[PDB]
Design a protein around this ligand. Structure first.
Ligand SMILES: O=c1ccn([C@@H]2O[C@H](COP(=O)(O)OP(=O)(O)O)[C@@H](O)[C@H]2O)c(=O)[nH]1
Ligand SMILES: OC[C@H]1O[C@@H](O)[C@H](O)[C@@H](O)[C@H]1O
Ligand SMILES: [Mn+2]
Length: 285
């Protein structure tokens, strides 16, 4: 049950003027595409705080990638869901290497020890299995957001993203035609997508939703990866290829624009991006 919003004074939405004319702001299945200009964060904050929303954030930091946690967590404290309840879940092979970062009120961090795989591909792929921590998340958070750790927040990432299921437009492909997308193209893989299919190319480094929908997604991607392994095939972009297949066949209820996962060194700051909110930290692969 949702109580009434309080009185609020803000600019009237004008029906005969779009918030953004340069970009697509709603998918053909009526899911908002979240860009700056399209939302009033004060209305959204009221709606979500009145539900006492708790957001879980998962991040994996295996092997050398523990070095990214300090900046990731400190910048998450300045920009990710401030004002709301947040539970960080740090999955790592080295619990003693997790930095002690100071958290704001209503925010907590859990360290979850996992095994390290040798190949960076298996580390990245096995997050789907590891996420699908099932009973624990249902009890502790309302939404789960799953991200890469080699990143920093530079601007607001808030409750405008929350919805039953979302993916994020990959920053290298948002202007690309679908035949250029790097989907898995071999019909022998479960992740296969033909050249005449595909809405968007979603980034493996930032997806989320309600706990139920995220567990559906991660279970389905982990089962599809197991089928490929048993067939001796590994998708071209690993868990990202499987997430793309899943989101083609289960449309997300919101799509985040590339504001939400950007790489300034590789792609600069185009005018269609008013804000760069969560951005790659340069590293040597
Ligand atoms: O040795 C590794 C390799 C991968 N990762 C995790 O898997 C994510 C995806 O891998 P990566 O960021 O290397 O992929 P890229 O963004 O460079 O394509 C990393 O952000 C970490 O969260 C990790 O922790 N340790
Ligand atoms: O083609 C897809 C690839 O695009 C890269 O630009 C990104 O660094 C990889 O992680 C994978 O997403
Ligand atoms: Mn990454």
């Amino acid at each position: 049950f949702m109580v009434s919003l309080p009185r609020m004074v803000y600019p009237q939405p004008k029906v005969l003027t779009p918030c953004r004319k340069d970009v697509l702001v709603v998918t053909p299945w009526l899911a908002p595409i979240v860009w700056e200009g399209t939302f009033n964060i004060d209305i959204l904050n009221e709606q979500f705080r009145l539900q006492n929303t708790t957001i879980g954030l998962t991040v994996f930091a295996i092997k050398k990638y523990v070095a990214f946690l300090k900046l990731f967590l400190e910048t998450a404290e300045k920009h990710f869901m401030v004002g709301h309840r947040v539970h960080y879940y740090v999955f790592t092979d080295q619990p003693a290497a997790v930095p002690r970062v100071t958290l704001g009120t209503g925010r907590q961090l859990s360290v979850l020890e996992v095994r390290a795989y040798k190949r960076w591909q298996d580390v990245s792929m096995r997050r789907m299995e590891m996420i699908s921590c099932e009973r624990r998340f249902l009890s502790e958070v309302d939404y789960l957001v799953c991200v890469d750790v080699d990143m920093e927040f530079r601007d607001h990432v808030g409750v405008e993203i929350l919805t039953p299921l979302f993916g994020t437009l990959h920053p290298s492909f948002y202007g690309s035609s679908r035949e250029a997308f790097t989907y898995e193209r071999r019909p022998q893989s479960q992740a296969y997508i033909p050249k005449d299919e595909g809405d968007f190319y979603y980034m493996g480094g930032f997806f989320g939703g309600s706990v139920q929908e995220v567990q559906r997604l991660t279970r389905a991607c982990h089962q599809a990866m197991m089928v490929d392994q048993a067939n001796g095939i590994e998708a071209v972009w690993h868990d990202e290829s499987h997430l793309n297949k899943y989101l083609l066949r289960h449309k997300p209820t919101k799509v985040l624009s590339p504001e939400y996962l950007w790489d300034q060194q590789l792609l600069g700051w185009p005018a269609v991006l008013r804000k760069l909110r969560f951005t790659a930290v340069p590293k040597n692969h």
